[PDB]
Amino acid sequence: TEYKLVVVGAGDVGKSALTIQLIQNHFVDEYDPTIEDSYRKQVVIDGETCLLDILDTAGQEEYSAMRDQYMRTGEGFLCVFAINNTKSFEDIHHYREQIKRVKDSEDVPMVLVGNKCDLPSRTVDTKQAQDLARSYGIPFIETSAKTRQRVEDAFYTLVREIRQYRLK
Amino acid sequence: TEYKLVVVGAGDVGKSALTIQLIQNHFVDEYDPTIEDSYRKQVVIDGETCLLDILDTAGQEEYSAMRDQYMRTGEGFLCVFAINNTKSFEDIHHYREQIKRVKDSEDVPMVLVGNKCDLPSRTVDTKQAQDLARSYGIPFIETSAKTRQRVEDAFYTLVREIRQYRLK
Ligand SMILES: Nc1nc2c(ncn2[C@@H]2O[C@H](COP(=O)(O)OP(=O)(O)O)[C@@H](O)[C@H]2O)c(=O)[nH]1
Ligand SMILES: Nc1nc2c(ncn2[C@@H]2O[C@H](COP(=O)(O)OP(=O)(O)O)[C@@H](O)[C@H]2O)c(=O)[nH]1
Ligand code: NA
Ligand code: NA
């Protein structure tokens, strides 16, 4: 039932920062007196209960056995790069292709995110990213976790993509 | 083929500290000229290629959709508590029971670890832990990631447990 979001992308692009910001304003204390302590947190986005996972192959998942399992379990993917990191943008295709392979489908809920849009030191232009998103058939959003710009929007977009996919 | 180790336990018991220490002295640069860049890191413990994963339900996996998948993929479990944290010891049974349930088996390679054995502020006695390990049928090891005591031993023990299990 819950929407399973997975944030993917190169290391140091702001996956953790984005997810923490989102959770900060979206967690609810859910009351259930038939469980220990009675109050578990859950994340609710655009009126949907969401589960959230970060696939971090640069850090926490470098020596991991779980990469393909994150991709099989995940329902929608936020593919993140940083606007000051050309390599992180170049890495998007590899992640996208992986997910496509694992899920064995051309149609996966995905949103492309260019993070750190507050930085003056841009090397990835909006148009480059737009072209990429358009090739994939997916939305593109620029975000900044530092300044809190379009963070909720990116997650909201992905939720909506998953909602549309589920209606098929 | 590779040994899939999963470190489980309450938050702040030293799972990350233990795993980082282990990796520090066990990673090898593996040369393979048919791949990009030619040199991927791998972890080798007791002459076995290992993959390493931390299940952290207090942090990185609190809102996660992946708990049961970590347990299904994992082959051996390092169950960690801290000797100054009574609650973290009380939580071991819950983790153990979860893994048993997910894997549908009484026989899972497991090692019980009491971490932070360098601390003077003990509330879990060695005998308590020994009794627990003995009930489970598994080794118990006290460790300190801070002072670097028995860290390799704990992982070596779990590797050996997995080796024995695989020989069945
Ligand atoms: N200027 C700026 N820095 C950011 C932004 N998001 C994250 N960072 C920083 O980038 C680094 C990597 O962030 P982190 O969330 O750890 O990236 P992850 O490795 O992809 O999870 C940290 O220093 C963050 O503070 C952002 O939108 N703008
Ligand atoms: N004294 C002491 N502190 C430790 C030890 N291992 C970890 N810590 C500290 O305990 C805290 C939690 O460690 P961390 O690895 O983040 O725990 P995790 O949440 O289980 O991954 C940090 O402040 C670590 O530095 C240890 O063996 N001894
Ligand atoms: Na790493
Ligand atoms: Na958390």
Side-chain angles (χ1 to χ4, degrees), chain B residues 1-35:
Chain B
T1 176
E2 295 98 317
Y3 286 25
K4 290 165 192 202
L5 280 71
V6 176
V7 189
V8 315
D12 242 59
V13 303
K15 304 190 293 301
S16 176
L18 283 164
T19 305
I20 286 163
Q21 217 112 41
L22 190 280
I23 287 166
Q24 171 71 259
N25 307 99
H26 280 269
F27 76 81
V28 315
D29 226 50
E30 176 202 3
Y31 175 65
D32 180 356
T34 70
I35 64 152

PDB file of all heavy atoms in Angstrom, chain B residues 1-35:
ATOM      1  N   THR B   1      28.074 -16.213  -4.424  1.00  0.00           N
ATOM      2  CA  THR B   1      29.422 -16.666  -3.979  1.00  0.00           C
ATOM      3  C   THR B   1      29.889 -15.838  -2.770  1.00  0.00           C
ATOM      4  O   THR B   1      30.164 -16.431  -1.747  1.00  0.00           O
ATOM      5  CB  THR B   1      30.377 -16.770  -5.187  1.00  0.00           C
ATOM      6  OG1 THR B   1      31.667 -17.109  -4.692  1.00  0.00           O
ATOM      7  CG2 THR B   1      30.499 -15.519  -6.040  1.00  0.00           C
ATOM      8  N   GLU B   2      29.985 -14.498  -2.854  1.00  0.00           N
ATOM      9  CA  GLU B   2      30.529 -13.677  -1.768  1.00  0.00           C
ATOM     10  C   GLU B   2      29.741 -13.878  -0.476  1.00  0.00           C
ATOM     11  O   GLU B   2      28.545 -14.078  -0.532  1.00  0.00           O
ATOM     12  CB  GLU B   2      30.425 -12.180  -2.053  1.00  0.00           C
ATOM     13  CG  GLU B   2      31.262 -11.698  -3.219  1.00  0.00           C
ATOM     14  CD  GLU B   2      30.491 -11.553  -4.514  1.00  0.00           C
ATOM     15  OE1 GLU B   2      29.684 -12.452  -4.841  1.00  0.00           O
ATOM     16  OE2 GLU B   2      30.699 -10.539  -5.193  1.00  0.00           O
ATOM     17  N   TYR B   3      30.399 -13.756   0.681  1.00  0.00           N
ATOM     18  CA  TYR B   3      29.720 -13.843   1.972  1.00  0.00           C
ATOM     19  C   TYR B   3      29.001 -12.520   2.262  1.00  0.00           C
ATOM     20  O   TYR B   3      29.652 -11.494   2.318  1.00  0.00           O
ATOM     21  CB  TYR B   3      30.690 -14.127   3.122  1.00  0.00           C
ATOM     22  CG  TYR B   3      31.248 -15.535   3.221  1.00  0.00           C
ATOM     23  CD1 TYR B   3      31.350 -16.371   2.121  1.00  0.00           C
ATOM     24  CD2 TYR B   3      31.639 -16.051   4.447  1.00  0.00           C
ATOM     25  CE1 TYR B   3      31.839 -17.667   2.227  1.00  0.00           C
ATOM     26  CE2 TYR B   3      32.148 -17.338   4.571  1.00  0.00           C
ATOM     27  CZ  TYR B   3      32.244 -18.152   3.452  1.00  0.00           C
ATOM     28  OH  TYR B   3      32.706 -19.443   3.549  1.00  0.00           O
ATOM     29  N   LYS B   4      27.689 -12.578   2.497  1.00  0.00           N
ATOM     30  CA  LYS B   4      26.862 -11.402   2.740  1.00  0.00           C
ATOM     31  C   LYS B   4      26.626 -11.181   4.247  1.00  0.00           C
ATOM     32  O   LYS B   4      25.775 -11.841   4.849  1.00  0.00           O
ATOM     33  CB  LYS B   4      25.552 -11.600   1.960  1.00  0.00           C
ATOM     34  CG  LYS B   4      25.709 -11.512   0.445  1.00  0.00           C
ATOM     35  CD  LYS B   4      24.547 -12.045  -0.322  1.00  0.00           C
ATOM     36  CE  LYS B   4      24.901 -12.193  -1.785  1.00  0.00           C
ATOM     37  NZ  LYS B   4      23.685 -12.212  -2.647  1.00  0.00           N
ATOM     38  N   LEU B   5      27.381 -10.244   4.831  1.00  0.00           N
ATOM     39  CA  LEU B   5      27.285  -9.949   6.250  1.00  0.00           C
ATOM     40  C   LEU B   5      26.352  -8.767   6.450  1.00  0.00           C
ATOM     41  O   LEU B   5      26.414  -7.802   5.688  1.00  0.00           O
ATOM     42  CB  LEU B   5      28.669  -9.618   6.812  1.00  0.00           C
ATOM     43  CG  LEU B   5      29.562 -10.816   7.123  1.00  0.00           C
ATOM     44  CD1 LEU B   5      30.041 -11.484   5.840  1.00  0.00           C
ATOM     45  CD2 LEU B   5      30.740 -10.388   7.993  1.00  0.00           C
ATOM     46  N   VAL B   6      25.486  -8.860   7.469  1.00  0.00           N
ATOM     47  CA  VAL B   6      24.609  -7.756   7.826  1.00  0.00           C
ATOM     48  C   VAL B   6      24.789  -7.467   9.314  1.00  0.00           C
ATOM     49  O   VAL B   6      24.681  -8.346  10.158  1.00  0.00           O
ATOM     50  CB  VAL B   6      23.131  -8.062   7.513  1.00  0.00           C
ATOM     51  CG1 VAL B   6      22.198  -6.930   7.997  1.00  0.00           C
ATOM     52  CG2 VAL B   6      22.914  -8.383   6.037  1.00  0.00           C
ATOM     53  N   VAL B   7      25.086  -6.221   9.629  1.00  0.00           N
ATOM     54  CA  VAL B   7      25.246  -5.798  10.999  1.00  0.00           C
ATOM     55  C   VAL B   7      23.927  -5.205  11.431  1.00  0.00           C
ATOM     56  O   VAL B   7      23.423  -4.309  10.758  1.00  0.00           O
ATOM     57  CB  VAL B   7      26.366  -4.756  11.110  1.00  0.00           C
ATOM     58  CG1 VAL B   7      26.691  -4.461  12.560  1.00  0.00           C
ATOM     59  CG2 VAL B   7      27.596  -5.198  10.341  1.00  0.00           C
ATOM     60  N   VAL B   8      23.368  -5.737  12.511  1.00  0.00           N
ATOM     61  CA  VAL B   8      22.111  -5.248  13.018  1.00  0.00           C
ATOM     62  C   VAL B   8      22.288  -4.839  14.472  1.00  0.00           C
ATOM     63  O   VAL B   8      23.196  -5.311  15.145  1.00  0.00           O
ATOM     64  CB  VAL B   8      20.995  -6.295  12.855  1.00  0.00           C
ATOM     65  CG1 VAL B   8      21.031  -6.912  11.476  1.00  0.00           C
ATOM     66  CG2 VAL B   8      21.066  -7.395  13.889  1.00  0.00           C
ATOM     67  N   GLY B   9      21.374  -4.000  14.947  1.00  0.00           N
ATOM     68  CA  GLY B   9      21.301  -3.643  16.357  1.00  0.00           C
ATOM     69  C   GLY B   9      20.708  -2.258  16.571  1.00  0.00           C
ATOM     70  O   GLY B   9      20.532  -1.521  15.610  1.00  0.00           O
ATOM     71  N   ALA B  10      20.413  -1.908  17.833  1.00  0.00           N
ATOM     72  CA  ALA B  10      19.913  -0.575  18.183  1.00  0.00           C
ATOM     73  C   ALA B  10      20.814   0.545  17.668  1.00  0.00           C
ATOM     74  O   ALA B  10      21.968   0.343  17.291  1.00  0.00           O
ATOM     75  CB  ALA B  10      19.757  -0.450  19.672  1.00  0.00           C
ATOM     76  N   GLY B  11      20.279   1.764  17.714  1.00  0.00           N
ATOM     77  CA  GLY B  11      21.011   2.935  17.258  1.00  0.00           C
ATOM     78  C   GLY B  11      22.122   3.290  18.231  1.00  0.00           C
ATOM     79  O   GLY B  11      21.941   3.110  19.430  1.00  0.00           O
ATOM     80  N   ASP B  12      23.258   3.795  17.717  1.00  0.00           N
ATOM     81  CA  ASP B  12      24.341   4.324  18.548  1.00  0.00           C
ATOM     82  C   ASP B  12      25.093   3.242  19.336  1.00  0.00           C
ATOM     83  O   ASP B  12      25.801   3.572  20.279  1.00  0.00           O
ATOM     84  CB  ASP B  12      23.852   5.418  19.514  1.00  0.00           C
ATOM     85  CG  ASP B  12      24.500   6.776  19.283  1.00  0.00           C
ATOM     86  OD1 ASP B  12      24.366   7.316  18.158  1.00  0.00           O
ATOM     87  OD2 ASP B  12      25.146   7.295  20.226  1.00  0.00           O
ATOM     88  N   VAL B  13      25.035   1.972  18.908  1.00  0.00           N
ATOM     89  CA  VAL B  13      25.786   0.907  19.563  1.00  0.00           C
ATOM     90  C   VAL B  13      27.179   0.716  18.941  1.00  0.00           C
ATOM     91  O   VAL B  13      28.001   0.021  19.521  1.00  0.00           O
ATOM     92  CB  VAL B  13      25.031  -0.442  19.572  1.00  0.00           C
ATOM     93  CG1 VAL B  13      23.664  -0.347  20.227  1.00  0.00           C
ATOM     94  CG2 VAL B  13      24.909  -1.063  18.207  1.00  0.00           C
ATOM     95  N   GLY B  14      27.488   1.349  17.808  1.00  0.00           N
ATOM     96  CA  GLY B  14      28.800   1.294  17.178  1.00  0.00           C
ATOM     97  C   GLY B  14      28.857   0.447  15.893  1.00  0.00           C
ATOM     98  O   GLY B  14      29.942   0.098  15.463  1.00  0.00           O
ATOM     99  N   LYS B  15      27.714   0.138  15.261  1.00  0.00           N
ATOM    100  CA  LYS B  15      27.636  -0.625  14.029  1.00  0.00           C
ATOM    101  C   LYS B  15      28.502  -0.006  12.927  1.00  0.00           C
ATOM    102  O   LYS B  15      29.265  -0.720  12.281  1.00  0.00           O
ATOM    103  CB  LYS B  15      26.185  -0.713  13.572  1.00  0.00           C
ATOM    104  CG  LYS B  15      25.226  -1.290  14.607  1.00  0.00           C
ATOM    105  CD  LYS B  15      23.849  -1.589  14.071  1.00  0.00           C
ATOM    106  CE  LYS B  15      23.118  -0.326  13.683  1.00  0.00           C
ATOM    107  NZ  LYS B  15      22.974   0.576  14.854  1.00  0.00           N
ATOM    108  N   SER B  16      28.382   1.312  12.748  1.00  0.00           N
ATOM    109  CA  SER B  16      29.117   2.021  11.720  1.00  0.00           C
ATOM    110  C   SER B  16      30.602   2.042  12.066  1.00  0.00           C
ATOM    111  O   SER B  16      31.433   1.720  11.219  1.00  0.00           O
ATOM    112  CB  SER B  16      28.564   3.410  11.531  1.00  0.00           C
ATOM    113  OG  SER B  16      29.346   4.120  10.593  1.00  0.00           O
ATOM    114  N   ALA B  17      30.917   2.371  13.326  1.00  0.00           N
ATOM    115  CA  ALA B  17      32.297   2.383  13.803  1.00  0.00           C
ATOM    116  C   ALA B  17      33.002   1.030  13.625  1.00  0.00           C
ATOM    117  O   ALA B  17      34.178   0.982  13.297  1.00  0.00           O
ATOM    118  CB  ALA B  17      32.316   2.807  15.248  1.00  0.00           C
ATOM    119  N   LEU B  18      32.312  -0.074  13.928  1.00  0.00           N
ATOM    120  CA  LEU B  18      32.853  -1.409  13.791  1.00  0.00           C
ATOM    121  C   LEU B  18      33.120  -1.732  12.333  1.00  0.00           C
ATOM    122  O   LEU B  18      34.161  -2.280  12.008  1.00  0.00           O
ATOM    123  CB  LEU B  18      31.859  -2.421  14.372  1.00  0.00           C
ATOM    124  CG  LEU B  18      31.826  -2.518  15.899  1.00  0.00           C
ATOM    125  CD1 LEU B  18      30.570  -3.237  16.379  1.00  0.00           C
ATOM    126  CD2 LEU B  18      33.076  -3.215  16.417  1.00  0.00           C
ATOM    127  N   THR B  19      32.160  -1.412  11.470  1.00  0.00           N
ATOM    128  CA  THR B  19      32.226  -1.765  10.067  1.00  0.00           C
ATOM    129  C   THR B  19      33.317  -0.956   9.359  1.00  0.00           C
ATOM    130  O   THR B  19      34.018  -1.477   8.500  1.00  0.00           O
ATOM    131  CB  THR B  19      30.836  -1.630   9.433  1.00  0.00           C
ATOM    132  OG1 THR B  19      29.897  -2.425  10.167  1.00  0.00           O
ATOM    133  CG2 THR B  19      30.819  -2.081   7.991  1.00  0.00           C
ATOM    134  N   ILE B  20      33.501   0.296   9.767  1.00  0.00           N
ATOM    135  CA  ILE B  20      34.498   1.169   9.173  1.00  0.00           C
ATOM    136  C   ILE B  20      35.890   0.673   9.537  1.00  0.00           C
ATOM    137  O   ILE B  20      36.745   0.594   8.661  1.00  0.00           O
ATOM    138  CB  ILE B  20      34.254   2.621   9.617  1.00  0.00           C
ATOM    139  CG1 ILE B  20      33.038   3.194   8.884  1.00  0.00           C
ATOM    140  CG2 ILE B  20      35.499   3.486   9.420  1.00  0.00           C
ATOM    141  CD1 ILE B  20      32.453   4.448   9.515  1.00  0.00           C
ATOM    142  N   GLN B  21      36.079   0.314  10.819  1.00  0.00           N
ATOM    143  CA  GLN B  21      37.325  -0.252  11.313  1.00  0.00           C
ATOM    144  C   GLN B  21      37.680  -1.519  10.536  1.00  0.00           C
ATOM    145  O   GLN B  21      38.791  -1.647  10.047  1.00  0.00           O
ATOM    146  CB  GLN B  21      37.228  -0.638  12.782  1.00  0.00           C
ATOM    147  CG  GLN B  21      38.518  -0.381  13.560  1.00  0.00           C
ATOM    148  CD  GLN B  21      38.263   0.729  14.540  1.00  0.00           C
ATOM    149  OE1 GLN B  21      37.206   0.758  15.163  1.00  0.00           O
ATOM    150  NE2 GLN B  21      39.187   1.668  14.655  1.00  0.00           N
ATOM    151  N   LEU B  22      36.723  -2.443  10.422  1.00  0.00           N
ATOM    152  CA  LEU B  22      36.932  -3.673   9.690  1.00  0.00           C
ATOM    153  C   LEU B  22      37.360  -3.356   8.257  1.00  0.00           C
ATOM    154  O   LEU B  22      38.376  -3.858   7.792  1.00  0.00           O
ATOM    155  CB  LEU B  22      35.643  -4.504   9.749  1.00  0.00           C
ATOM    156  CG  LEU B  22      35.732  -5.947   9.235  1.00  0.00           C
ATOM    157  CD1 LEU B  22      35.658  -6.009   7.708  1.00  0.00           C
ATOM    158  CD2 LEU B  22      37.006  -6.624   9.721  1.00  0.00           C
ATOM    159  N   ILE B  23      36.628  -2.462   7.580  1.00  0.00           N
ATOM    160  CA  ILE B  23      36.889  -2.179   6.179  1.00  0.00           C
ATOM    161  C   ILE B  23      38.274  -1.551   6.044  1.00  0.00           C
ATOM    162  O   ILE B  23      39.009  -1.887   5.116  1.00  0.00           O
ATOM    163  CB  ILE B  23      35.782  -1.306   5.554  1.00  0.00           C
ATOM    164  CG1 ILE B  23      34.488  -2.102   5.335  1.00  0.00           C
ATOM    165  CG2 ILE B  23      36.253  -0.710   4.242  1.00  0.00           C
ATOM    166  CD1 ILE B  23      33.259  -1.247   5.051  1.00  0.00           C
ATOM    167  N   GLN B  24      38.611  -0.667   6.990  1.00  0.00           N
ATOM    168  CA  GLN B  24      39.880   0.021   6.991  1.00  0.00           C
ATOM    169  C   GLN B  24      41.030  -0.964   6.768  1.00  0.00           C
ATOM    170  O   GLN B  24      41.935  -0.678   5.997  1.00  0.00           O
ATOM    171  CB  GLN B  24      40.049   0.771   8.308  1.00  0.00           C
ATOM    172  CG  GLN B  24      41.445   1.337   8.489  1.00  0.00           C
ATOM    173  CD  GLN B  24      41.658   2.493   7.552  1.00  0.00           C
ATOM    174  OE1 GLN B  24      42.292   2.362   6.501  1.00  0.00           O
ATOM    175  NE2 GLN B  24      41.087   3.626   7.926  1.00  0.00           N
ATOM    176  N   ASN B  25      40.999  -2.131   7.421  1.00  0.00           N
ATOM    177  CA  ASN B  25      42.143  -3.024   7.368  1.00  0.00           C
ATOM    178  C   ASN B  25      41.874  -4.227   6.481  1.00  0.00           C
ATOM    179  O   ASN B  25      42.633  -5.172   6.499  1.00  0.00           O
ATOM    180  CB  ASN B  25      42.507  -3.538   8.757  1.00  0.00           C
ATOM    181  CG  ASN B  25      42.701  -2.413   9.742  1.00  0.00           C
ATOM    182  OD1 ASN B  25      41.802  -2.101  10.519  1.00  0.00           O
ATOM    183  ND2 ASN B  25      43.848  -1.763   9.663  1.00  0.00           N
ATOM    184  N   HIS B  26      40.789  -4.230   5.720  1.00  0.00           N
ATOM    185  CA  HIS B  26      40.459  -5.442   5.002  1.00  0.00           C
ATOM    186  C   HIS B  26      40.127  -5.186   3.541  1.00  0.00           C
ATOM    187  O   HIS B  26      39.898  -6.147   2.806  1.00  0.00           O
ATOM    188  CB  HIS B  26      39.312  -6.142   5.726  1.00  0.00           C
ATOM    189  CG  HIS B  26      39.805  -6.894   6.891  1.00  0.00           C
ATOM    190  ND1 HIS B  26      40.157  -8.214   6.711  1.00  0.00           N
ATOM    191  CD2 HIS B  26      40.087  -6.569   8.161  1.00  0.00           C
ATOM    192  CE1 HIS B  26      40.617  -8.667   7.867  1.00  0.00           C
ATOM    193  NE2 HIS B  26      40.581  -7.682   8.749  1.00  0.00           N
ATOM    194  N   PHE B  27      40.074  -3.916   3.129  1.00  0.00           N
ATOM    195  CA  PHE B  27      39.786  -3.621   1.736  1.00  0.00           C
ATOM    196  C   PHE B  27      41.028  -3.925   0.916  1.00  0.00           C
ATOM    197  O   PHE B  27      42.138  -3.724   1.389  1.00  0.00           O
ATOM    198  CB  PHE B  27      39.292  -2.183   1.550  1.00  0.00           C
ATOM    199  CG  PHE B  27      40.317  -1.084   1.617  1.00  0.00           C
ATOM    200  CD1 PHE B  27      41.111  -0.791   0.516  1.00  0.00           C
ATOM    201  CD2 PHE B  27      40.440  -0.291   2.748  1.00  0.00           C
ATOM    202  CE1 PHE B  27      42.032   0.248   0.556  1.00  0.00           C
ATOM    203  CE2 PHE B  27      41.351   0.754   2.786  1.00  0.00           C
ATOM    204  CZ  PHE B  27      42.138   1.024   1.688  1.00  0.00           C
ATOM    205  N   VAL B  28      40.808  -4.410  -0.304  1.00  0.00           N
ATOM    206  CA  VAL B  28      41.863  -4.583  -1.291  1.00  0.00           C
ATOM    207  C   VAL B  28      41.440  -3.878  -2.568  1.00  0.00           C
ATOM    208  O   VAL B  28      40.273  -3.925  -2.931  1.00  0.00           O
ATOM    209  CB  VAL B  28      42.144  -6.076  -1.561  1.00  0.00           C
ATOM    210  CG1 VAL B  28      42.215  -6.859  -0.265  1.00  0.00           C
ATOM    211  CG2 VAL B  28      41.115  -6.709  -2.483  1.00  0.00           C
ATOM    212  N   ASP B  29      42.414  -3.275  -3.256  1.00  0.00           N
ATOM    213  CA  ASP B  29      42.244  -2.798  -4.621  1.00  0.00           C
ATOM    214  C   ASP B  29      42.339  -4.017  -5.541  1.00  0.00           C
ATOM    215  O   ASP B  29      43.399  -4.616  -5.640  1.00  0.00           O
ATOM    216  CB  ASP B  29      43.291  -1.709  -4.887  1.00  0.00           C
ATOM    217  CG  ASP B  29      42.783  -0.442  -5.561  1.00  0.00           C
ATOM    218  OD1 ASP B  29      41.777   0.126  -5.078  1.00  0.00           O
ATOM    219  OD2 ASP B  29      43.428  -0.002  -6.547  1.00  0.00           O
ATOM    220  N   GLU B  30      41.211  -4.438  -6.127  1.00  0.00           N
ATOM    221  CA  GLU B  30      41.156  -5.545  -7.076  1.00  0.00           C
ATOM    222  C   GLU B  30      41.275  -5.041  -8.524  1.00  0.00           C
ATOM    223  O   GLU B  30      40.452  -4.259  -8.993  1.00  0.00           O
ATOM    224  CB  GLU B  30      39.828  -6.287  -6.930  1.00  0.00           C
ATOM    225  CG  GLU B  30      39.636  -7.406  -7.942  1.00  0.00           C
ATOM    226  CD  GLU B  30      38.192  -7.813  -8.199  1.00  0.00           C
ATOM    227  OE1 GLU B  30      37.273  -7.187  -7.624  1.00  0.00           O
ATOM    228  OE2 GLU B  30      37.985  -8.767  -8.971  1.00  0.00           O
ATOM    229  N   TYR B  31      42.272  -5.545  -9.260  1.00  0.00           N
ATOM    230  CA  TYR B  31      42.538  -5.111 -10.623  1.00  0.00           C
ATOM    231  C   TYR B  31      41.720  -5.922 -11.619  1.00  0.00           C
ATOM    232  O   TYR B  31      41.719  -7.145 -11.553  1.00  0.00           O
ATOM    233  CB  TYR B  31      44.022  -5.256 -10.932  1.00  0.00           C
ATOM    234  CG  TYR B  31      44.401  -4.958 -12.357  1.00  0.00           C
ATOM    235  CD1 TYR B  31      44.260  -3.688 -12.872  1.00  0.00           C
ATOM    236  CD2 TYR B  31      44.918  -5.942 -13.176  1.00  0.00           C
ATOM    237  CE1 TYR B  31      44.637  -3.392 -14.165  1.00  0.00           C
ATOM    238  CE2 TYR B  31      45.299  -5.670 -14.477  1.00  0.00           C
ATOM    239  CZ  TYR B  31      45.148  -4.391 -14.982  1.00  0.00           C
ATOM    240  OH  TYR B  31      45.509  -4.118 -16.279  1.00  0.00           O
ATOM    241  N   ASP B  32      41.020  -5.215 -12.516  1.00  0.00           N
ATOM    242  CA  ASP B  32      40.191  -5.797 -13.565  1.00  0.00           C
ATOM    243  C   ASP B  32      40.157  -4.809 -14.729  1.00  0.00           C
ATOM    244  O   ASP B  32      39.399  -3.848 -14.703  1.00  0.00           O
ATOM    245  CB  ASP B  32      38.777  -6.117 -13.069  1.00  0.00           C
ATOM    246  CG  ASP B  32      37.839  -6.740 -14.102  1.00  0.00           C
ATOM    247  OD1 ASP B  32      38.246  -6.877 -15.269  1.00  0.00           O
ATOM    248  OD2 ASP B  32      36.691  -7.092 -13.723  1.00  0.00           O
ATOM    249  N   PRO B  33      41.017  -4.977 -15.760  1.00  0.00           N
ATOM    250  CA  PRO B  33      41.115  -3.995 -16.843  1.00  0.00           C
ATOM    251  C   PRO B  33      39.898  -3.916 -17.776  1.00  0.00           C
ATOM    252  O   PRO B  33      39.746  -2.929 -18.498  1.00  0.00           O
ATOM    253  CB  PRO B  33      42.386  -4.436 -17.587  1.00  0.00           C
ATOM    254  CG  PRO B  33      42.502  -5.916 -17.305  1.00  0.00           C
ATOM    255  CD  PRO B  33      41.961  -6.095 -15.906  1.00  0.00           C
ATOM    256  N   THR B  34      39.055  -4.961 -17.762  1.00  0.00           N
ATOM    257  CA  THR B  34      37.731  -4.933 -18.363  1.00  0.00           C
ATOM    258  C   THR B  34      36.741  -4.497 -17.291  1.00  0.00           C
ATOM    259  O   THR B  34      36.112  -5.337 -16.665  1.00  0.00           O
ATOM    260  CB  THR B  34      37.327  -6.310 -18.902  1.00  0.00           C
ATOM    261  OG1 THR B  34      37.101  -7.151 -17.766  1.00  0.00           O
ATOM    262  CG2 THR B  34      38.366  -6.907 -19.828  1.00  0.00           C
ATOM    263  N   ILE B  35      36.792  -3.202 -16.980  1.00  0.00           N
ATOM    264  CA  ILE B  35      35.796  -2.421 -16.252  1.00  0.00           C
ATOM    265  C   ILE B  35      36.380  -1.014 -16.243  1.00  0.00           C
ATOM    266  O   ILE B  35      37.592  -0.854 -16.435  1.00  0.00           O
ATOM    267  CB  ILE B  35      35.420  -2.867 -14.807  1.00  0.00           C
ATOM    268  CG1 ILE B  35      36.586  -2.768 -13.809  1.00  0.00           C
ATOM    269  CG2 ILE B  35      34.737  -4.237 -14.758  1.00  0.00           C
ATOM    270  CD1 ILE B  35      36.180  -2.537 -12.358  1.00  0.00           C
TER     271      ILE B  35
END
